[PDB]
Amino acid sequence: AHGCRHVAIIMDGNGRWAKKQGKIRAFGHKAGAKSVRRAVSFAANNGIEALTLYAFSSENWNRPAQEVSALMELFVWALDSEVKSLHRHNVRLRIIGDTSRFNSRLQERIRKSEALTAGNTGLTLNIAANYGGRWDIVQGVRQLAEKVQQGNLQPDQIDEEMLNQHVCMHELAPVDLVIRTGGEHRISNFLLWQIAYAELYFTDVLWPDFDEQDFEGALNAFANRE
Amino acid sequence: GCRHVAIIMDGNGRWAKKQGKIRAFGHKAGAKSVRRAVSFAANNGIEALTLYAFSSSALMELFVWALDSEVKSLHRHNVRLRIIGDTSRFNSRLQERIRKSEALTAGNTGLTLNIAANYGGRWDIVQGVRQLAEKVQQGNLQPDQIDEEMLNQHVCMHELAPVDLVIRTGGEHRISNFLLWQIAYAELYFTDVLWPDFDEQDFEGALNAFANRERRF
């Protein structure tokens, strides 16, 4: 009844949530993981076809660039145990983002995870990893530029419909709703091309507290903004 | 400090209906609201204001009339005018009035006023992409040297301050294929106020909210 086929969520607020409890950041990450499981569960049980998730990091600015990098590795590493669970729940997993510089072992783990679940018929879960909406448009542009160089494409032949076929998730239903938790009212270079016509829904709720009733609220807001 | 504000103007028609009036009446109050927003922005030190008339030859002629009767005043008021969007198919007379209007004000140093006409964010990115494909075809550019900075140099308004705040009136919470590339880091502010009613107090509310959020985030 919500009529929403594909929801994207900019998750934020985990560190502030922990801070308020008098707990260190790591406890926030723990509670945030639980909230991710819960939103994925809700989406699957509510007939949403695709759910795309972006972890917005409020602390990354204070982290040296080389820690960030290693942080991307732990993510893929953790993503080897979690896939087993996603697969048991009939979830099809896709990673979107610039994974070309990750080491071969990671790239292999990622492809194997997407291959394992590619045939599942449940929710399609897209996880952003090293993703940027401008980078997304740029990688599509590069693919087209390569065709132009080969001599198979004239610059005047490039139109929206063609660039669209080369940005992330072009093969899935278009994003109908973007939710951003944590209070900030910005897209922060998450999807740009893909959100041209999506409903944007912002809530002050911190990610760890964002639960099924908050997700239903966004979906009903969407249904009503029709 | 907000340097560039973009506004998705919407609600003139709904506004006229609530008054029991026709669409033309909503357009008239709408023009007055554009005038007040432009003055407000110029008076409060905003460097660029970008306006997008959201709609769900008569016009083309009015566009000519509008340019002919207001450009001298915008020039006088030190406003730099730019039209962003695909005007490639407007009639030549109008295309020439646009070009001349931008040329006459190209040197002004006050508010840059960007008016969208047949503009779309995807189209904007696509025109930038065509320009880069031309250099690849010419042989002056390798596909793998194309990066964000380079495409950024080929989308509308790259010569101005980055868009800091996007305001959409009328109650919808969508970008509707207005700016996309350009709003990657902008504060987004939605208000149910209908365009004709959008006034200095409403505009101040969006500006104060931007400044406070800049402080908090």
Ligand SMILES: O=P(O)(O)C(O)(Cc1cccc(-c2cccc3c2oc2ccccc23)c1)P(=O)(O)O
């Ligand atoms: O746990 P802390 O945030 O205290 C820190 O160890 C960095 C870190 C270590 C181990 C795991 C994580 C972590 C865990 C879950 C999600 C994410 C984490 O780090 C990021 C960054 C960006 C997005 C998501 C997550 C972060 P720090 O160097 O910032 O103190």
Ligand SMILES: O=P(O)(O)C(O)(Cc1cccc(-c2cccc3c2oc2ccccc23)c1)P(=O)(O)O
């Ligand atoms: O816990 P369930 O298997 O019941 C389910 O929530 C799916 C799910 C469970 C647990 C974790 C995740 C998930 C998915 C991808 C990556 C990561 C997940 O949780 C973490 C924690 C830390 C790092 C990465 C991930 C998803 P479901 O919708 O399939 O029932």
Ligand SMILES: O=P(O)(O)C(O)(Cc1cccc(-c2cccc3c2oc2ccccc23)c1)P(=O)(O)O
């Ligand atoms: O919310 P904050 O910006 O405070 C921060 O927790 C980063 C963060 C944002 C959003 C989600 C998560 C997070 C935490 C644990 C598990 C997972 C998170 O995001 C995903 C995506 C996919 C699978 C698992 C998780 C972390 P931080 O490390 O910058 O303090």
Ligand SMILES: O=P(O)(O)C(O)(Cc1cccc(-c2cccc3c2oc2ccccc23)c1)P(=O)(O)O
């Ligand atoms: O600057 P960006 O916002 O583009 C990004 O690189 C930030 C980022 C850097 C490093 C790790 C993560 C990240 C994202 C989701 C889940 C987890 C991340 O890091 C960890 C560590 C341990 C468990 C989960 C996650 C995010 P992104 O991967 O969220 O696109």
Ligand SMILES: O=P(O)(O)C(O)(Cc1cccc(-c2cccc3c2oc2ccccc23)c1)P(=O)(O)O
């Ligand atoms: O078709 P008509 O000539 O009857 C009329 O709609 C013309 C009209 C007057 C004023 C504004 C508009 C109008 C309508 C849709 C979009 C835009 C309009 O004006 C601008 C300016 C710049 C960008 C978009 C629009 C139309 P009207 O208000 O004089 O009845």
Ligand SMILES: O=P(O)(O)C(O)(Cc1cccc(-c2cccc3c2oc2ccccc23)c1)P(=O)(O)O
């Ligand atoms: O607000 P609505 O979407 O109801 C509609 O008035 C279209 C419209 C939206 C926003 C502004 C305008 C409009 C009206 C009069 C003058 C000008 C308008 O937009 C601009 C931009 C620049 C200069 C003058 C005007 C028209 P409509 O013609 O589709 O009913």
